[PDB]
Design a protein around this ligand. Structure first.
Ligand SMILES: NC(=O)C1=CN([C@@H]2O[C@H](COP(=O)(O)OP(=O)(O)OC[C@H]3O[C@@H](n4cnc5c(N)ncnc54)[C@H](OP(=O)(O)O)[C@@H]3O)[C@@H](O)[C@H]2O)C=CC1
Ligand SMILES: NC(=O)C1=CN([C@@H]2O[C@H](COP(=O)(O)OP(=O)(O)OC[C@H]3O[C@@H](n4cnc5c(N)ncnc54)[C@H](OP(=O)(O)O)[C@@H]3O)[C@@H](O)[C@H]2O)C=CC1
Ligand SMILES: NC(=O)C1=CN([C@@H]2O[C@H](COP(=O)(O)OP(=O)(O)OC[C@H]3O[C@@H](n4cnc5c(N)ncnc54)[C@H](OP(=O)(O)O)[C@@H]3O)[C@@H](O)[C@H]2O)C=CC1
Ligand SMILES: NC(=O)C1=CN([C@@H]2O[C@H](COP(=O)(O)OP(=O)(O)OC[C@H]3O[C@@H](n4cnc5c(N)ncnc54)[C@H](OP(=O)(O)O)[C@@H]3O)[C@@H](O)[C@H]2O)C=CC1
Ligand SMILES: O=C1C[C@H](c2cccc(O)c2)Oc2ccc(O)cc21
Ligand SMILES: O=C1C[C@H](c2cccc(O)c2)Oc2ccc(O)cc21
Lengths: 264, 254, 254, 265
């Protein structure tokens, strides 16, 4: 009876805020996490206190590596979607929010091979496997039992067309996610599964450098001269998931305060 | 108090849907029309019946020509539209450049100078002047009296990168409008005036089967709700961007 | 047999360099100018001293206004520019829309002049010129047509990251981008290719140090070689595309 | 001073045409191949007979998998391709990322699924990344006074992936990463004067393994000429972007598609 959202990397920051925004609209939310077990369970607790049985947590490394028979990434992704159907009997919304982000400079061991798998798995390959698994489930549901508003959001990046110096794999991974948005929107249109991108510029900018540098980097955003709040992104995601957005598919909405209109 | 929306080409179809959407959020709406006085006045009557003094109508040709009363330029008519809002309600918070002529200007086989003025005016030049007048008024308001949510929406087209055969001047003017959205967003950022695009693909046709999502054109609400969302405070960090509302039509190839 | 190129704003800088490059490939070149009569003529003389009957000059204001004889409209002026190629050499194979005014049209604190000047030269004159060029080609019987028709529109690599205060200009280049796409689709049956070239910083008169490649603006040749390549028979499958020549400048962000 | 070009998937079609067009301009060419040994060796023989010792061949699976010797990583096989150029001719001026696998990965109906991902993503995106890395390291490790004057990297992307081909998601995704690679490497390698550009074909030398009406149906949709392109119609563009006349063009994509991307259903 109640719609279901699967949110990857739901524990903190934009993931938490998306999970909360959907929750506030009456979704039950499956809270995916990798490292951040404590933050995910705290968030689950808060949502379940607000509305009983409105949240669960599931752990998964979305790197394109086999784990713990070794278990593939595809399996782990299928298992994420399956947790939604096991617990609540449905999965209506998928938000591919989880994402690794760190330098892979082109100009100078097993940190190389783990980087590619981590940055590609989380940003691109796992989203592919998630969308596929989400779609198989919809396909397998008799039409009379289908949800009436299936929506998938990929968090891409407003700024990867002006690439961040030294972040090539990340930039390529987000490039791939963009492709996913356009290819899945096309192929899944027959099943009325909408697929769209949301692309933050500077959002909840990590405070881990001198204040002058942090204030320097925010002040470049033309609108407000700051990085966004998490809700300023997440509200956009909740709007794209809503029935008022039911004719939107295959598009990317930039949420960047005009940062992409800038030049050096 | 009550925020105000100026919606051009408000009388019918998407413009009417946008004016209705905005009015449902609590906006007073100034309903611009050109030829559709009957339809624009009936819409005003409906909205004023729902909420007293919540709509007005104003007439202007948005073509890039002079009109008689010294002849009146496009720029002056555009300033007078924005002014009409200020005169009547003391504010103009939202501007929706919706009015648009759309007809063939083929490259292959006099009043081709009519097309230029008409297609280029409504779609690109009048929006530029409207944005300019809009911004002047905000800049002219002492900061402590300014609203908190200035929003300009340009109605562009999802399909203009895959041009409609024979619609060159229309296609060009949409390309001009997209440039207006980016340049205005950047220059108006310091006054907190957001500027975004909404591109319909196929909407309320008066080829439907080619749209990946649903194999139909959209309702007017399917577009105008997106407009309303972009104007709301939840969309306050969005500027300079363009939202396609095309059911995936731009993903297709012949 | 000798093909003909018409180059707008051919007197100096990129226009000159494109005209030279075309000429170097053996084109007869029609050198359009507005105010630079001395430089156009001096260029013509050099190219005529190299090969007789290989260069002419034609004056035209490309602003979207009427001029002195009924008055002469921009359409007539554009058609006559193309007629000059046919009158003198019996053909027009290549059109380069290079002429371009460029100056501030600020949104925040003569408006008619900016509008006519920046839109005409950048967008409407290219439209009329493309239309005249194409009409000629269509009116030539098939057996007598050239085998390599090329239109190049000079656009701007940086207009997605707009220059602050230059709205009408940025809109006009966006209109020209749309002209590239719409004309390439419509003119493909007559095998008229239409492409853009987007210079970034070129032959400046301190943004230069920000260009990732070489930390300088380009030379004129650095751009015009691209234009020559796109007109060559090696580029015969390219149409409706835009080539940035900007040393990676459009890759940057504040 | 004979400049050198590495061309991945050089044995046939567009790769071979690119390897020829570079050879014709005076390049020594290292012709990479995977399963097409015989075609590659044939083309090498042809170009060596025009100009002795101006072609070699190297074999590598560019799939993102470890191979038969410790196992050998994709990263290593990629470094080894750029190495072959230095070992044999002392330089590598031009890299063309052309190798590409292309087949469907439908979202709608499983050692097939693993192998597709590693192959499609390896060939179209991750191999180019490592090739670029290796090519740049060499340039960085060459003392400035000995560096060539015209380094150029071309990635063969696709004019049409913004209008995706139904059922080819991993391919489309890989091409999207490859576009990212162009933009990112152009910016980062700009200080070494290493230009990085994309060339995006539309319908080029279209394989005829459907009924004639299907082939002719496809081709007829191309606005310019109502045909697919020759290999040369793409490779000439590659050659131009590598030439010294293109020395200010970096981080850009050139579509070679006869207007196909302008169309709508
Ligand atoms: N903040 C910003 O300005 C920008 C954000 N974005 C994008 O928006 C989205 C949300 O942004 P933000 O909240 O800042 O993202 P974060 O960087 O905070 O990452 C969110 C989560 O992704 C999860 N994650 C990372 N790697 C893996 C992995 N290998 N497997 C599983 N989970 C993983 C982490 O989970 P856990 O903590 O449980 O380990 C982390 O909490 C991301 O996709 C990001 O790329 C894009 C541009 C700018
Ligand atoms: N519907 C669709 O499928 C699509 C729509 N769009 C865009 O969406 C917007 C709204 O679409 P739609 O509702 O179909 O538009 P319409 O074609 O119905 O036009 C809306 C109004 O614009 C006004 N108008 C036209 N020319 C002039 C002029 N010279 N001066 C002043 N007003 C003028 C007319 O007002 P009046 O009746 O008062 O004279 C008209 O009712 C437009 O900007 C359009 O470009 C884009 C792509 C597809
Ligand atoms: N150089 C650069 O950095 C950049 C250039 N570009 C584009 O590249 C092209 C060439 O650049 P560049 O050589 O610098 O151009 P210029 O600014 O030097 O101008 C070129 C010529 O345009 C002609 N022109 C201007 N206005 C009119 C008018 N109303 N009617 C007729 N002709 C007119 C002038 O002719 P006359 O002198 O005879 O009066 C002028 O010499 C242009 O389209 C430009 O917008 C784009 C981005 C950057
Ligand atoms: N032709 C067209 O219409 C289009 C082409 N393109 C792009 O242009 C480029 C060239 O096109 P085209 O000539 O048709 O290419 P092909 O599809 O013929 O493939 C090119 C070569 O790539 C090699 N290859 C494939 N998978 C691998 C792998 N895992 N490892 C190593 N090598 C591999 C093959 O080498 P071998 O034979 O040695 O095994 C093959 O000969 C490609 O990158 C393609 O994606 C893009 C859009 C349309
Ligand atoms: O009525 C339409 C549909 C029309 C349309 C019709 C058919 C195909 C297509 O891409 C677009 O687009 C319009 C553009 C501007 C406008 O003011 C009205 C319309
Ligand atoms: O001379 C220039 C440089 C100039 C310029 C200067 C500085 C930044 C930038 O993006 C562009 O751009 C032009 C645009 C049109 C034109 O006719 C000439 C120029």
């Amino acid at each position: 009876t109640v719609p279901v959202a699967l949110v990857t990397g739901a524990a903190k920051r934009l993931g938490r805020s998306i999970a909360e925004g959907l929750h506030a609209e009456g979704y039950a939310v499956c809270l995916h996490y990798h490292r951040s077990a404590a933050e995910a369970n705290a968030l689950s607790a808060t949502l379940n206190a607000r509305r009983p049985n409105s949240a669960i947590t599931v752990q998964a490394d979305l790197s394109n590596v086999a784990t713990a028979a070794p278990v593939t990434l595809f399996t782990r992704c299928a298992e994420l979607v399956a947790a939604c159907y096991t617990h609540w009997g449905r999965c209506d919304v998928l938000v591919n929010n989880a994402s690794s982000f760190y330098p892979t400079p082109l100009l100078r061991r097993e940190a190389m091979e783990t980087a590619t798998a981590d940055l590609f798995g989380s940003n691109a390959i796992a989203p592919y496997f998630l969308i596929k698994a989400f779609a198989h489930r919809v396909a397998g549901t008799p039409a009379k039992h289908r949800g009436t508003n299936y929506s998938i959001i990929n968090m891409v990046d407003a700024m990867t067309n002006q690439p961040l110096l030294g972040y090539t794999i990340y930039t390529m991974a987000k490039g791939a996610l963009e492709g996913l948005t356009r290819s899945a929107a096309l192929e899944l249109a027959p099943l009325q599964i909408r697929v769209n991108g949301v692309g933050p510029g500077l959002s909840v900018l990590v405070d881990d450098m001198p204040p002058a540098v942090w204030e320097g980097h925010r002040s470049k955003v033309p609108l407000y001269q700051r990085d966004s709040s998490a809700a300023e992104v997440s509200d956009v995601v909740i709007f794209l998931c809503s029935s008022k957005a039911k004719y939107i598919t295959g598009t990317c909405v930039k949420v960047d305060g005009g940062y992409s209109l800038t030049r050096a």
